[PDB]
Write a protein that binds this ligand. Structure first.
Ligand SMILES: C/C=C(\C)CC/C=C(\C)CCC=C(C)C
Ligand SMILES: [Cl-]
Ligand SMILES: [Zn+2]
Lengths: 536, 494, 318, 4
């Protein structure tokens, strides 16, 4: 069966088209609005008629029908807690009202929050009421510590804490003091219940920090080029700010571009250098880059007979892959780790635990737990097969970092990464100074555009991979040898991008299907006339 | 009362919990019932007493007549069965008054003065969140006549210290005593117990050993073992599948009304019987306190009880007769084997586990040690329970007895409290009471000598923590009396 | 740990769906018919079956909804709202009849909804929602009018809705939700701000949405919905992490959600089917590569065809 | 047929 509920509707339209901002409709609305609380149009007509007495009719009808609503709303929410329409009307109503009845709000909230600890509509409304009645952050920070102890799956709860704690205490994610505490509060959140993603996610976010920045300044004499690398991708010459160059303690206007000249947000930017900034009139030249908008400043000096000079921020000295745990912190984490291996014995198939065991090792001593970390990924890859791709790129990222750290420590520009089963490349913007890069024997399916940051790359050994795309090789100033034997370069069009490598002389491609095309050696010589030797 | 109708469908003698329930069932069922009791108060051995009421009660069991006049009323073709004329269920009544008369010191006169602020139960029992009685209370709405309060904690006494036992998800979390590792083991294992049936082969091999030998093999520290064994499972010998069934009931009760499995009637357990008696009255039941019955008038031929004769000589006819054990002659019960319950009722000036929020009903379990010794459960009541004056706690101890109540419970009491004295860290004991109650529960009806078929017997309390026994026999009885018959907002809390 | 269990519908029933949507409209759904038509039309189109819908009637209906303020209402008589405004521009954009409504008003209606923080209210009754920061930017984009608003400010707002886990919620402070990540990543793509999104982080949170049944949910501790398949995959494609999902497991789930009888797709295997999920089911398969569904745009949820025509297609993440 |  079915009831003609539409009739009441067509009625409200008629009883409106003229200007009946009365109550004869304000009631008929509750009729449809009861079943279809998502019929936004109605919440309007109602929101209309009734504001036609909130400045008109006697306060003994208005202030009265006022509460008459706060009752109706609860009645709607009861049957439909999830509904942007309802909750909005309430926000609207409780906004207009002259008297701040907020007191009863923080209770109506706790009411629905208890019924459904996972109703974002309610937490959003509470956030509203809290902001209105100016509830102290600490006050709310307690409401969460309680909702967390009783509940088993409270993500909305931890999420909120992530917003509250920052605004209570302004390296680490939170102040050493607040941090070490919050950790303990979470360490048992998942020990009590490890099948609660919540605790696990929040826990990950607690091991990181934020970034302030000019992270490198390189100057090649032969290229008469000055290269600059930023912490994150920004756009020089626009809001964010721009770059100023000071050569020999005097400004020098330069144009700034990205490797592909499209000048979109990027880690790398560069400018050409005039003869004066590189000639012999002085025993040396001083370059000083100043990024406004953060004012990060970098400065390097180019001696009379040196081919290049730079000023880079060591990933190590900047703790980008670690965090240099303070004697105290270190101990709490070292304790955090051990406790987790136990949790694994009890909960062997808990992917979250295994994973967190890895993140903990990355936080303590990435290089030390290298053998271990790799063993856990194996374990993890087995218990959680659906995230094999994820784990792989993650293992790849960490593997890269360890290598970068070794290179910085060894103080060289050769980055070895052969036989690491790498599936992706990361932090390429840290590689700017690298001259030789070996990425052969891995599972890379592509060299990425981000590879453009490698302004000193002379040789690129990427043989034996699953490379199907080599687009990121484009625009590499110093690239002279590009080895790509045995890969998956199918068509010769996949080599098109290489015509942007002005110094490319050796191009080994043997092993790719593309060599099977007829006249491939001739087609390529046409396409890359500058490349002296092209083995195919 | 001295001019009762001469006809009734069923007569109930005694106002204990079981008799009361059954009395209500039959009234709601359309049956005309006459409910009488000898005492001048409701409840039999389930009764509640003010302090003055308690003093009188124990006094009549420390002191120690031919009146057979109904004989001229026994027809030629009839036989009579004399009932008991004196109650012999309480024994070894021992009392101690440590208070000053018999920092804010409480004196004996204070208790006397405040005597009505007390409600000492002879029966020490907690209500289970989800048990037969609680449902019955709700389904019959008898609960309307009573408010309830949640037991705010389970406790364990070890190494001469009282501590709180973590038993809920929230407790384990906040606990700062369970090593991170433990919180997992416990939480893991408990989640198993509620579903122990879902893992038939996770204990199967142990389906033939001590539930304590089993818990020794599981992934539980010894600490957590004690907890699950005594504090949660509360099982004394106990079979492996027994502790599981127990812990399961505990866990399925946890949460329903609070952070614990139990409730406590406001004003005491003694209120429960009176609730059902009220319904009984509501549906036409006729009540008579201080109204004893002399004998049962058995029909010489059909051999069925056909009526009774009360103290006023009135001859009252009924179809059924329910009689609480106590009201039967030493003869009728010459064959019955009984058990004895050791009881202690202490009045103290402080909680066993001192805290900032001192208004709370907690329960402790002291595991026996001796072979024939049993598990002693001590239930501490705060004044808010409405069973004792402000500034004091009413602590009840119970256990199946070996010897006299005092010999069974004195040791525990001396380990938990210290006798008050002018020699002005555990609470102070101001007044202790020990006594033994007869346990006539779980006795086969055929053990009674010559009672007609239409005469049923209700038992008194049992040493069991809850009231499932009282509800069961009442429903069993209701089966035999009213065949193919039948026995809604929930309770109210403090 | 609460996931569904696929029974023993493993094959894409194109025609069966084609019939469902083509026969749909022939009750209480009216308060959103504009978007309703938009789902049915878009899905049919992705199935090279757009010719089975009354363009004329739809076009007349669209015009009938553009109220004298620019905004478009879900249905004739109802109130104008960004949502139905976008749904309509889309209907018209894929019907190339984008001349039926007053484009100048629509662009006015949109800017008239941006606040000083950059956000966008749903309608005149001020309902700030990143869900609407998308509708605005998407509508303008499909009209080459993305300049009408304060793009710099609208971006600042959307970025302030980023949570500790990489995702985005309804408004500053809100909880990361799948449907809200789509709108913010879609808006971030349209406004060339993807370099702000943290691909690795949000990408992880996003793949974790996939349960053992193969399906995906909208947030931690929830059941898979074939509709979150679209919303999660689309966000993944935009941020370039689509390879982090198990294409197969998901393909089986999505396929199971279809009624081998009535046609169309259902939220979960066995429940009722509707046009909303029929679109996101077909849409989801499209993003995973299917030789029977035209490539769908992971930003406008329309045929990548229709979008290459209007020459509107933000470059996604590398 | 939507919700949130
Ligand atoms: C009722 C639906 C939600 C709360 C999820 C929010 C997502 C949207 C509103 C997407 C609209 C955009 C298009 C694909 C046209
Ligand atoms: Cl009980
Ligand atoms: Zn859905």
């Amino acid at each position: 069966k079915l009831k003609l509920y539409q009739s009441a509707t067509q009625a409200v339209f008629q009883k409106r088209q003229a200007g009946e901002l009365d109550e004869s409709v304000l009631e008929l609305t509750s009729q449809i609005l009861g079943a279809n609380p998502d019929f936004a149009t109605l919440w309007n007509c109602r929101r209309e008629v009734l504001q036609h007495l909130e400045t008109e009719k006697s306060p003994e009808e208005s202030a009265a029908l006022v509460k008459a609503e706060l009752g109706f709303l609860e009645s709607c929410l009861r049957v439909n807690p999830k509904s942007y329409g309802t909750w909005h009307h309430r926000c609207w109503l409780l906004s207009r009202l002259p008297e701040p009845n907020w007191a009863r709000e923080l209770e109506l909230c706790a009411r629905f929050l208890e019924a459904d600890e996972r109703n974002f509509h309610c937490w959003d409304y509470r956030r509203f009421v809290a902001a209105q009645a100016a509830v102290a952050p600490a006050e709310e920070l307690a409401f969460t510590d309680s909702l967390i102890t009783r509940n088993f799956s409270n993500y909305s709860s931890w999420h909120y804490r992530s917003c509250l704690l920052p605004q209570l205490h302004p390296q680490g994610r939170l102040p050493e003091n607040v941090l070490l505490k919050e950790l303990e509060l979470v360490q048992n959140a998942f020990f009590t219940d490890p099948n609660d993603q919540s605790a696990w996610f929040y826990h990950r976010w607690l091991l990181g920090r934020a970034e302030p920045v000019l992270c490198c300044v390189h100057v090649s004499r032969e290229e008469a080029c000055l290269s600059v690398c930023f912490s994150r991708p920004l756009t020089v010459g626009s809001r964010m700010g721009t770059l100023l160059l000071m050569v020999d303690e005097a400004p020098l206007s330069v144009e700034w571009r990205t490797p592909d000249g499209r000048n979109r947000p990027s880690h790398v930017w560069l400018c050409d250098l005039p003869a004066a900034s590189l000639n012999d009139q002085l025993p040396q030249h001083t370059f000083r880059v100043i990024w406004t908008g953060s004012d990060s400043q970098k400065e390097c000096v180019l001696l009379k007979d040196r081919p290049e000079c730079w000023c880079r921020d060591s990933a190590t000295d900047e703790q980008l892959f670690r965090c240099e745990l303070s004697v105290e912190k270190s101990t709490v984490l070292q304790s955090e780790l051990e406790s987790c291996k136990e949790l694994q014995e009890l909960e062997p198939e808990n992917k979250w635990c295994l994973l967190t065991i890895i993140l903990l090792m990355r936080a303590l001593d990435p290089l030390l737990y290298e053998k271990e970390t790799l063993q856990y990924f194996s374990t993890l890859k087995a218990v959680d097969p659906m995230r094999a791709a994820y784990l792989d790129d993650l293992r790849s990222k960490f593997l890269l970092e360890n290598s970068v750290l070794k290179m910085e420590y060894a103080d060289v520009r050769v980055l070895h990464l052969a036989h690491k089963d790498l599936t992706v490349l990361c932090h390429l913007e840290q590689l700017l100074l690298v001259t030789h890069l070996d990425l052969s024997h891995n599972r890379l399916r592509a060299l990425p555009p981000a590879l453009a940051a490698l302004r000193c790359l002379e040789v690129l050994q990427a043989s034996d991979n699953a490379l199907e795309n080599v687009d990121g090789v484009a625009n590499l100033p110093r690239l002279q040898e590009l080895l790509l034997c045995n890969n998956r370069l199918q068509q010769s069009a996949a080599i098109q991008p290489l015509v942007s490598c002005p110094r490319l002389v050796l191009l080994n491609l043997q092993g790719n299907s593309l060599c099977q095309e007829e006249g491939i050696q001739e087609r390529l010589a046409e396409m890359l006339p500058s490349v002296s030797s092209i083995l195919t | 009362a001295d001019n009762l109708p001469s006809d009734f469908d069923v007569i109930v003698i005694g106002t204990g919990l079981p008799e009361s329930i059954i009395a209500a069932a039959c009234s709601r069922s359309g049956q005309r019932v006459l409910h009488v009791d000898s005492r001048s108060y409701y409840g039999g051995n389930w009764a509640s007493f003010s302090f003055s009421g308690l003093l009188s009660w124990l006094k009549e069991y420390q002191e120690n007549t031919e009146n057979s006049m109904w004989q001229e009323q026994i027809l030629e073709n009839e036989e009579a069965i004399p009932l008991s004329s004196k109650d012999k269920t309480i024994q070894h009544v021992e009392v101690f008054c440590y208070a000053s008369q018999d920092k804010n010191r409480i004196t004996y006169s204070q208790i006397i003065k405040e005597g009505r602020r007390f409600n000492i139960d002879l029966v020490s029992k907690l209500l289970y969140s989800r048990g037969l009685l609680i449902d019955l209370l709700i389904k019959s709405n008898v609960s309307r006549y009573a408010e309830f309060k949640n037991i705010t904690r389970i406790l364990a006494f070890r190494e001469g210290t009282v501590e709180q036992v973590p038993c809920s998800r929230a407790d384990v979390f906040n606990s700062k005593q369970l090593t991170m590792v433990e919180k997992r083991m416990l939480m893991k294992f408990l989640t198993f117990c509620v579903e122990y049936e879902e893992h038939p082969d996770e204990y199967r091999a142990y389906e033939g050993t001590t539930f304590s030998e089993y818990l020794k093999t599981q992934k539980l520290t010894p600490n957590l073992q004690y907890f699950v064994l005594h504090s949660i499972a509360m099982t004394s010998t106990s079979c492996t599948v027994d502790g599981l069934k127990a812990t399961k009931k505990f866990l399925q009760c946890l949460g329903r009304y609070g952070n614990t499995p139990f409730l406590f009637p406001l004003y005491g357990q003694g209120e429960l019987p009176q609730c059902f008696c009220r319904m009984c009255a509501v549906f036409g039941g006729i009540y008579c306190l201080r109204h004893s019955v002399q004998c049962l008038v058995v029909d010489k031929e059909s051999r069925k009880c056909k009526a009774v004769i009360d103290q006023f000589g009135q001859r009252i006819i009924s179809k059924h007769f329910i009689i609480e054990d106590s009201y039967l002659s030493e003869n009728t019960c010459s064959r019955v084997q009984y058990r004895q319950i050791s009881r202690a009722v202490l009045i103290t000036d402080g909680s066993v586990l001192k805290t900032d929020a001192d208004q709370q009903v907690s329960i402790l379990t002291v595991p026996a040690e001796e072979p024939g010794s049993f598990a002693v459960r001590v239930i501490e009541l705060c004044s808010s329970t409405m069973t004792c004056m402000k500034g004091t706690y009413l602590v009840h101890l119970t256990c199946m007895s070996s010897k006299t109540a005092r010999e069974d419970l004195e040791r525990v009491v001396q380990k938990l409290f210290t006798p008050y004295t002018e020699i002005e860290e555990k609470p102070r004991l101001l007044w202790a009471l020990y006594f033994n109650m007869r346990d006539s529960s779980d006795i086969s009806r055929d053990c009674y000598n010559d009672l007609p078929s239409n005469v049923y017997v209700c038992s008194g309390p049992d040493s069991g923590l809850g009231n499932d026994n009282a509800v069961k026999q009442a429903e069993t009885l209701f089966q035999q009396i009213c065949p193919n018959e039948d026995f809604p907002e929930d309770i109210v809390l403090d | 740990k609460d996931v569904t269990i696929k029974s023993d519908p493993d094959t894409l029933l194109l025609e069966k769906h084609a019939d469902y949507i083509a026969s749909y409209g022939s009750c209480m759904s009216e308060y959103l018919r504009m978007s309703g038509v938009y789902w049915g039309l878009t899905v049919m189109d992705l199935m090279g079956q757009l010719h089975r819908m009354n363009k004329e009637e739809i076009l007349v209906f669209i015009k009938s909804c553009q109220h004298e303020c620019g905004g478009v209402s879900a249905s004739i008589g109802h109130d104008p709202h960004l949502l139905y405004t976008l749904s309509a521009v889309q209907i018209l954009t894929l019907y190339d009849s984008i001349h039926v409504i007053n484009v100048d008003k629509v662009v006015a209606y949109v800017q008239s909804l941006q606040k000083e923080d950059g956000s966008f209210a749903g309608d005149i009754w001020g309902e700030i929602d990143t869900r609407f920061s998308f509708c605005a930017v998407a509508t303008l984009a499909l009209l080459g009018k993305l300049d009408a608003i304060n793009v710099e400010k609208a971006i600042e707002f959307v970025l302030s809705c980023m949570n500790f886990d990489g995702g985005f919620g309804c408004r500053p402070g809100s909880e990361s939700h799948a449907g809200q990540i789509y709108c913010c990543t879609g808006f971030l793509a349209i406004t060339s701000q993807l370099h702000q999104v943290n691909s690795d982080l949000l990408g992880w949170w996003l793949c974790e949405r996939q349960l053992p049944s193969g399906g995906l949910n909208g947030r931690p501790e929830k059941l898979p919905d074939v509709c979150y398949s679209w919303w999660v995959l689309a966000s993944l494609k935009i941020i370039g992490r689509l390879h982090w999902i198990d294409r197969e497991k998901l393909r089986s789930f999505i396929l199971a959600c279809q009624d081998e009888e009535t046609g169309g797709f259902a939220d979960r295997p066995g429940d009722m089917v509707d046009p909303f999920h029929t679109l996101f089911g077909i849409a989801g398969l499209s993003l995973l590569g299917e030789e029977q569904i035209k490539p769908v745009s992971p930003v406008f949820c329309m045929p990548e065809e229709v979008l290459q025509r209007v020459n509107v297609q933000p470059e996604l993440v590398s | 047929a939507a919700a949130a």
